Amino acid sequence: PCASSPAFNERMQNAPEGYYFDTPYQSYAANLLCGAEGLPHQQLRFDRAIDVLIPFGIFFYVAGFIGWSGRAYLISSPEETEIFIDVALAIKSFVQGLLWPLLAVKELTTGELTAPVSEVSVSP
Amino acid sequence: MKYFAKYLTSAPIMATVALVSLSVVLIELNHFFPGLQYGTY
Amino acid sequence: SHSVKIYDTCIGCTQCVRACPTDVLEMVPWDGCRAGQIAASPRTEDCVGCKRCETACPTDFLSIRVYLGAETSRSMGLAY
Amino acid sequence: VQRGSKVRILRPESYWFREVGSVASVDQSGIKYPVVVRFSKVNYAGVNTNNFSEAELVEVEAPP
Amino acid sequence: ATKFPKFSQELQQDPTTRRIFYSLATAHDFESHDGMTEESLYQRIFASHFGHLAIIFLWTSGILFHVAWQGNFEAWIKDPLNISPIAHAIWDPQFGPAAMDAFTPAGAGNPVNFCYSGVYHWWYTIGLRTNGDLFAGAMFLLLLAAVMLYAGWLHLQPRYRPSLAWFKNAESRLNHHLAGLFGVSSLAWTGHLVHVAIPESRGQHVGWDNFLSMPPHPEGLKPFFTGNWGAYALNPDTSEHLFNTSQGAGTAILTFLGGFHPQTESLWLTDMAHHHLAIAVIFIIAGHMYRTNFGIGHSIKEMTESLQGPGWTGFFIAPNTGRGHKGIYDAYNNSLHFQLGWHLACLGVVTSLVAQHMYAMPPYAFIARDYTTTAALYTHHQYIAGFLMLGAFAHGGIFLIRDYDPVANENNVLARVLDHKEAIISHLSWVSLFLGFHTLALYVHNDCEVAFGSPDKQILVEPVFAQWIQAVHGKALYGISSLLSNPDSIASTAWPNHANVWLPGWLEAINNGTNSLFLAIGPGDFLVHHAIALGLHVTTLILVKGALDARGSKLMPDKKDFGYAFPCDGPGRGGTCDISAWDSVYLATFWMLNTLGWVTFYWHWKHLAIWSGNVAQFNEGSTYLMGWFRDYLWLNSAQLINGYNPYGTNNLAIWAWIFLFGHLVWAISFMFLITWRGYWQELIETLMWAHENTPLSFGYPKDKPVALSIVQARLVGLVHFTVGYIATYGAFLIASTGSRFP
Amino acid sequence: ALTGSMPKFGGSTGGLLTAAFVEERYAITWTSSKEQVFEMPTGGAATMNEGENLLELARKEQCLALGAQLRTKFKPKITDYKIYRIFPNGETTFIHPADGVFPEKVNEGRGYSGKKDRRIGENPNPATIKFSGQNTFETDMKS
Amino acid sequence: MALSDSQIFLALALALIPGFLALRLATELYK
Amino acid sequence: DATQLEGAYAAAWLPWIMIPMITYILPFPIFAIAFLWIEREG
């Protein structure tokens, strides 16, 4: 642990204080796992399971939000809506884009998330 | 000002406002703990 | 010399002939399209290979193809 | 195939292979590629229509 | 019309200087040659192979001759830790006496080159002890090269040229190569290892004058014929055995100790003799599988054509593959490009295996302590392997252009991967994009944290999966009591059998934290492994994309009618620069070079920090990119670039000169790579004006000066980029290691 | 044998070289209604005489660039230009217009010289014409 | 021990056999 | 010590003549032979 690490205290008690090392060296040292160089190492264990879910799972929501807002705006379109973003249809695809997680599983089973092999252009 | 609103809905204007609006997390990364590691939130 | 081949998707628009800088191409009667014309490439010993004829062709895919072949002093565009 | 029918292209070398385009006009002059098909999506050369045979088209919408 | 080249009438009609350049880079493409039949093609390739083996034997003979005449082999076997092996002698008349003195060591009377190829260690581990032994080997290889040359000349004679059905025999060749090129050769190498190498390792001299006298074992072929084979594994070399001397020696010839000889820090010679014997027996067995002309055996064609459909008699691990492997045997056997691109992929995987295995399990005596030799050998084989993997995909594309038959391969696996090639290319693109964004952004975050005075805020992710695979082999470096790390586990004990007699020797070596066998890895290793993943994925993207789009894409549907290498299809359709499949191997050579740069940079810095003792330099300095820039490139350059300064010259003067030479060649590449053809053609037209109008200038070009063609200059700039990239790093790696650790 | 006055020009470095007299030269003749300045394809400005003009150039592309300039940059257009190929023995050969019309029009009697009744995407794929000499468009079938 | 002058001259004379065998194979492969 | 090039090896007079032959005496004849080979006419 970082609290009992013997090398992590030589960056504790000799560093600028400021507001980037004083309110950040604490919460960090309480709940991190340092090695031998006095450096927090991002671990992947059972204790990290409810730690790495908030970077991994909460990024998946906002990334799918962006990808589904870019989808629902662009199915309802036609070469002027990409230049001049129609703010009304953008808000319509954002409101539906909020709960995109449900809509995404309401497309795969219905077969309207994927296109047929003969309805998509290919090359020789 | 009929097309002044339309010019403000153009791709560069939406681009610049989107970057500055998502990138204003300056205040989110200064309000509480300007250093936030993976296991600390 | 290069090989300039004209295929039956030609529509006789003449644009390949007009775009040729070295006069390789001309129009011949065909009755295989409604223009009644098709391109031909007899003076293909003159072909430099610029493919302006292919840029001028409107059909998809091109009704005229240039295949760069053995280089001569004419196809290399050499005034020396 | 006559004017207005949406057709899918069966020409492998076409830019719009396996794509739906609207028939503009069919030529009854006995030429090799009589059907003119027009596409909402342009090719690389900047051309959105082309002449096809009837044998390389599949009707997907009868004209209304 | 000239008479050169005789293999192409179209290049003889060429009135310009292009035919000289195109006759050099189309000379070995026998398929596209005038009046070439398939039979004449195979026969010419056979004779070319013989001439190639002759060149290899002449090269090895020359290495042996120059170590025996100008090296210090006999002086180096006395102390292979404090004496630098010598390659050959310098005879540059342009040296000043300051360079003659700098390239002369303490024990030499002339300027010499220090050998970094490792042949001293290899020859010392296999029995060679004197310059006479080296000279005898060199003269044997000279005569063997003459034999290969005569064989190649002989099989071009009309009564001796093999028929095409002989070349198509894929059942006889596999039997004779498995059993007789891999088996009998490895059995003979086991014979040498127990007759010469292990005896000379113990101090007894065995030569072609007393080997019939001296038995390899006290009971000569008594335990083998009687069936008691465990006698050959009795009384091995003790831990306090000194190589080439009888102090600590044993008598065993085939034992399975595992780990390393503790005095040479290399693999045991009894283990290597036992290895090559157990390899020879299995390969001699395996060369009995296919039928030639004795009825018994398999047919490869019937085995491949039987993987068509579903069911247990059919291809059941992928029943939805259409015609399965029908036509795949003929695609392999008829196409020489399919075979060459397949064999190049196999050889490029084996060469990377060679590089990855010979540093972690050193096979030669005292080569783990020759640091520059170890580094040079790893980098050598990894770059050879990257080139072989690049040529594998090159000839996979050339097969799909030239030899692929879409009707013989109708709806099989090959034609089934050609169908959905956009899925393969887009998913390689996704993996490449994910790896690149994440690895670069993690490195740049670490840079910005360290620059802003917060090394503690770096994102340091441990390679827990590879640390666990290090633990399942018996590494107690971490707190993971896994399979072989757990001493009373099912894997460690071999419960019914208890015959893993390799376990104590192997755990003496993996836990020994001084060798390279399973080095300790931390957060700086995870990032560079993800960079290597990115590099292999993007190189595979470029090569796979260019091979699968070789026959045609949407931008150029009839690309197979234009060949493998062609400049472009003009500026129509938006422009079609670098559209050929050859241009993909072109564009992926840069990415192969970059990936192998990352690989060898990682290996070299990891080992420099280990060899110096300051492993924390790489540990807490390889997680951000300025640490790579400053603690690796800038720091280990101070001795190289001071090879000659305004005060004098040391023996690193040639490495400084070659460092600058590689920089020059790499920069010259950018001239061919950035500037394109029409600029130079107009410049050459002005030069032609100037020459015809100057007095007293009586020469005139027989063949018209033209600028290098588009594909030609792509190849020339790529060759320059490659040669300068290899020269710069070869000069830096030999001088940053040979100076710190002389 | 060729009629026409050489256009009034001061000379240039862009003109004829050795290959003009050892390989081939081209000549373009045209009639102009007035004495007027054109651009040489070799660089510079020359003046065409009123009446018949004859100019020797090194390439057929230069003669066709000049001819395209004559029929597009001048009002009234000069469309009566004729291009000849001159050989080192003196032999002159009338090449443009090859027929006597103008390739862009259609004459009854020209004849097919590049036509391949196919549709490009159906050339014989190269696995079958390997050791033959033919390459994929210089063939006769359609697969 | 070190090589002798006669051992170097033996090498030089014996490499004339691959030297002319290589020329024979090069001209038999027909440039 | 080393005022000039030496050979502490057998037949050390052989570099003295072999380096001129391989590097600046025989190469221009070889270049001339190859130039005459590539420029000969049918």
Ligand code: F6C
């Ligand atoms: C022989 C033949 C001939 C002649 C005569 O004869 C000649 C001449 C001239 C004159 C006139 C002039 C001036 C001179 C001077 O100053 O400068 C020098 C250079 C040189 C190179 C010099 C040269 C000399 C000669 C070569 C001599 C010889 C030597 C020997 C013989 C060798 C030996 C042999 C053996 C076998 C190896 C020139 C020049 C030029 N070039 Mg020129 N050449 C020629 C060749 C060549 C080739 C191969 C190439 C490719 C590399 C080129 C290239 C070039 C360029 C880039 C340029 C330039 O810049 C310049 C000019 O333009 O101005 C303006 N060019 N030029």
Ligand code: CLA
């Ligand atoms: C940077 C990668 C790298 C490294 C460290 C080496 C290292 C080595 N190579 Mg090499 N080699 C490489 C890439 C590399 N190779 C590639 C990509 C090719 C394919 C063309 C070769 C082909 C090759 C041959 C034919 C031979 C070697 C040999 C050797 C060994 C002796 C030379 C020496 O001591 O150090 C110096 C290393 C340098 C890179 C010095 C720079 C010299 C520049 C590169 C000359 C440019 C020529 C060309 C690009 C590659 C030449 C490499 C080689 C001659 C040194 C040495 C272990 C020799 C050997 O096997 O010993 C018995 C040998 O005969 N290699």
Ligand code: CLA
């Ligand atoms: C291919 C292996 C090889 C290589 C790379 C070298 C390299 C060298 N030799 Mg050596 N040599 C070799 C084989 C080789 N030798 C063999 C087998 C013999 C026994 C006859 C000799 C006998 C020899 C002598 C007497 C001398 C050298 C010397 C030298 C050095 C200067 C060059 C020279 O004078 O050439 C001289 C070459 C010969 C007299 C005979 C060469 C015969 C080889 C086998 C030719 C190999 C051709 C090759 C396989 C074809 C490649 C094709 C092409 C694409 C490159 C140089 C380092 C000189 C030296 O020591 O410098 C200080 C010196 O004077 N060599």
Ligand code: CLA
């Ligand atoms: C037992 C009989 C026999 C043997 C020994 C061979 C041997 C050979 N054949 Mg042949 N062949 C045979 C029967 C045989 N053949 C029959 C019956 C047929 C008719 C079907 C053929 C038809 C045939 C053809 C058409 C060709 C060959 C070729 C070859 C050569 C290719 C392999 C090579 O270059 O060397 C090296 C390979 C090895 C030494 C083994 C490689 C194993 C791995 C890759 C390396 C070993 C790993 C190990 C770590 C190495 C460390 C060493 C290091 C420390 C120095 C080789 C010498 C090729 C040729 O013509 O060459 C002239 C070729 O084109 N053969």
Ligand code: CLA
């Ligand atoms: C077993 C190995 C092997 C073999 C037999 C071949 C054989 C062949 N390849 Mg090849 N290839 C290979 C591996 C191999 N390849 C590898 C490892 C790569 C990746 C680098 C390639 C990538 C490749 C491409 C892209 C192409 C081929 C082609 C060919 C064919 C013609 C080659 C040629 O034109 O003649 C002779 C060519 C030369 C003699 C050129 C030599 C110059 C090279 C490039 C660099 C020389 C190094 C330089 C001089 C060092 C100087 C440094 C110092 C002095 C300063 C031929 C059948 C061509 C083909 O099939 O056409 C359709 C083709 O386009 N290959």
Ligand SMILES: CCCCCCCCCCCCCCCC(=O)OC[C@H](COP(=O)(O)OC[C@@H](O)CO)OC(=O)CCCCCCCCCCCCCCC
């Ligand atoms: C390495 C030591 C120093 C090197 C110096 C010598 C280097 C090679 C010199 C080339 C002269 C050969 C001229 C052939 C003249 C000849 O007989 O022409 C034969 C052939 C074409 O001849 P034609 O059929 O046109 O012959 C017609 C007329 O001769 C009369 O009809 O040319 C070739 O084969 C070129 C390929 C040779 C490729 C050579 C490379 C092989 C390396 C050889 C190593 C030589 C070592 C010799 C000493 C041991």
